Amino acid sequence: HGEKSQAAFMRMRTIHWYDLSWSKEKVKINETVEIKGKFHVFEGWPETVDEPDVAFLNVGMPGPVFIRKESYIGGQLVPRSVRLEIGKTYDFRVVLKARRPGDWHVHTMMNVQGGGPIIGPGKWITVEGSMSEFRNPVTTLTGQTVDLENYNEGNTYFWHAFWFAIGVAWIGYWSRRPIFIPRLLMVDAGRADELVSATDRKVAMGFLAATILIVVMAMSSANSKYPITIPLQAGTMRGMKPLELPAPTVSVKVEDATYRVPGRAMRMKLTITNHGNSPIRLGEFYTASVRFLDSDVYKDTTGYPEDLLAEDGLSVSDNSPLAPGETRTVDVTASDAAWEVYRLSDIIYDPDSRFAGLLFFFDATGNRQVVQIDAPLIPSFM
Template sequence: MKSLNIQSLARCVTARAVRLWIFGLAVAGAITTLPAATPAAAHGERSQQAFLRMRTLNWYDVKWSKTELNVNDEMELTGKVHVFSGWPQAVAKPGESFLNVGEPGPVLIRKSAYVGEVPVPRTFSMDVGKDYEYKIVLKARRQGRYHVHVQINVKDGGPIVGPGQWITIKGDMKDFTNPVTLLEGSTIDLETYGITWTYIYHFFWMAAATAWILYWFMTKGIIVRYWQVKAGKGAELIGQDEKRIGAITLAAVLLAVVVFYAAANKEFPRTLPMQAGLLTGISPIDEPRSTVAVQFKGGSYTVPGRELRIRVKVANNGKEPVRLGEFTSAGLRFLNPEIFTTRPDFPDYLLADRGLSVSDPNPIAPGETRDLEVIVQDARFDIERLSDLAYDTDSQFGGLLFFFSPSGERQKAEVGGPVIPRFQAGAAL
């Protein structure tokens, strides 16, 4: 009786009904998915934890050579990065890193990248506590307005995103070209080179996969096979015809792989492997040792006021008086308006031009050591979700302090450590 019911149901489930069912599911999926597929405005760097952005890579002197380009125009993304000495234990150290650019797809292609004077087409190593200078050469490919970041991918640590700037690209993508001269002297366009065979190979294997799926699907169908397995007749699903088709398909696939490989090897006898090596020994920035020493003495973060207060002991070992002018962390710049009388060229959403103040604004004389209370307060601290450090396990911050002398000389000092979260405005440090 059970076998008779299965055979009756199998006759009822026609191939047309199954196809209509699959088609309906596909249409429903497309209708519900397409409205949500809107372009991304930025890269979600705010979703990264505060400790990851503050205590790993401290970006400074970041510059975009252009903010408006035409298709095929080139621009440079340059700057410096300080590898924080108090690198978090939960994040893999940057022994294997890759200099990259964060963008919504290949809207700009990366023509070249350098750390110092060394080209870095592949992974390189960085040392904790050192500073490195970088340059990325980009070429505009797709018209539109995009948020473009510097980014370093750390093995087992993920991407660490730096400051971003809005870049406008004008023109038409169909005019984009990417010419490259090969070793034998010929020139090819990487944008279109080999694209025909790429399509052929993809559609060939898609057609083969589709034929394989349709064969198994149309012979008995998924539902009928399910019923037979439930009825204990799963062993009868694969007969001699199915085994014969499987063997023929396997032989055809292996033959196609061999033929395609031989054809490609004949046309391109000289090939290079992917650049998967590790560049070591890249020298950090060779800069004079800072004459300003900073010792962290404690701090707090007041959640309602979006205010970071830190106590530091500053020793001026230079020949000129210095004043604290800037605190930078996670790509954000908090400026002392007494030092920065004009607004620097930097993305507005990352620039708090009146976000820094000190308890004693007087210059620190040469040879003097002074205790200072540094107040960092701006809504951007909360908008960029750096205030989440109050909820971290160890509640530690990190960043760079910049001191300026009357002659314009700048001194950099790393600062970081645990801060006490406070949930009441006006609480004492």
């Protein structure tokens, strides 16, 4: 929710999410659900999106229907913003605790610095149970174990009510008397200054001194309990460990790529050329969270969101094994309602008709090669 309305080429050429997995589809309150995967920051990052020098690994949901217990880019826990580097692939892991009963479309998203929430695929997860069951316990370096759901709640309230009351008390003191039309006219013809006088100005400095007094008393009383406190921990984490990917064995070349307007399909003419040594076939074209597969070749088992998985969405003019050393040109068609439903079709309103995706190739014994393609994508109407 929130992708779809954002520019189709940003969605294509910004971050690619793959090897996504969700530990659970249905979950009880207080239970854990773990999201894993990889993302690539596209080498051809658009203009116009500040490079992800300060990015944040977020979660796309309707507020705290879950809470984020942990998050990890590379091996590292990531509660700050992190510097990601264009071109690199990373593995992430988000760990959610369930908090509100319902049906939630949970996404994994990146937050970028200068302009943009970069929203990955969303999967529906269901939380059963009562919100009154939810606990967020946390042990401090100070001994105590508290519940973050309610920690410091009453304190917060008290101080607010107390100070609010005093606010009222002060206006209340002055409003025993008549407030406007008499006081206004006294000021007018002739002098005011009959309107105020100690005992008024005693009360004035009563309040004034009492206020300063209570603040300092309260503060060094608050310092007395809670003598051990740190400042908010902040600051972008550099040195994110990227994934070391083997150099791919297939290389592809995109000669023209077109889409029908209106339509539900993108054609592209690829010259796939198989270096390395096992007969290779094309199994998937991933484009903007939308996955087009040739079921002749590959079948998702990870339960990828049903609306984004095009089971036999991908057709190759010739998808026989491509022998090692051999190179062929092939016409490929990615085709599925998702192309219209997730509005990739809206690329026609974009000021940069260029797409970008990942192709996944599979050899005989089922091990894979990931090449990335990008190219201009040109409309055809007639």
